[PDB]
């Protein structure tokens, strides 16, 4: 339900 | 005692997720297994967002720390474990581990005390 994206 | 507010981490880089959350026990800790996004990040973004509301990026921003150690991975494979220990004084110990090179880092962030 929740991933982990970067920036 | 109980936490001063809803504590949680920010997933997908920009969204607020709750882990401790207010109305809980101060002496709390938990290691969950989250996945990474955007193949070839070689670094995971663990933001500690303590709040409970729709559309974050406005609540109490605990802290932001950058992790690294997840070479070119097409999602799903990356293994990041997050542990958060809350103390009486009002501190939070967050830690994310990476499964690809054996890299891991931890940082301390004061929940909400100040003066």
Cα separation, B42 vs B87, whole angstroms? 31
Cα separation, B56 vs B8, whole angstroms? 11
Q: List domains and CATH numbers for chain B.
A: 1-115 (2.60.34.10)
Nearest residue, CB atoms, A6 vs list B34, B43, B75 = B43
Residues of chain B neighbouring A4 (CB-CB closer than 8 A): 11-13, 34-37, 44-46, 80
Dihedral of CA atoms B37, B43, B48, B51 in degrees, nearest 10, equals: -20
Q: What angle do CA B101, B109, B98 make, to 5 degrees?
A: 10
């Amino acid at each position: 339900n929740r991933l982990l994206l970067t920036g | 005692d109980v936490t001063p507010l809803s504590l949680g981490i920010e997933t997908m880089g920009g969204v607020m997720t709750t882990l401790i959350a207010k109305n809980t026990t101060i002496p709390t800790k938990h290691s969950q297994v989250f996945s990474t996004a955007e193949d070839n990040q070689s670094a995971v973004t663990i933001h500690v967002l303590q709040g409970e509301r729709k559309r974050a990026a406005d609540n109490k921003s605990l802290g932001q720390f950058n992790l690294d150690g997840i070479n070119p991975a097409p999602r799903g494979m990356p293994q990041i474990e997050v542990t958060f220990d809350i103390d009486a004084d009002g501190i939070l110990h967050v830690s994310a581990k990476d499964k690809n090179s054996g890299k891991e880092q931890k940082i301390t962030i004061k929940a909400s005390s100040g003066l």
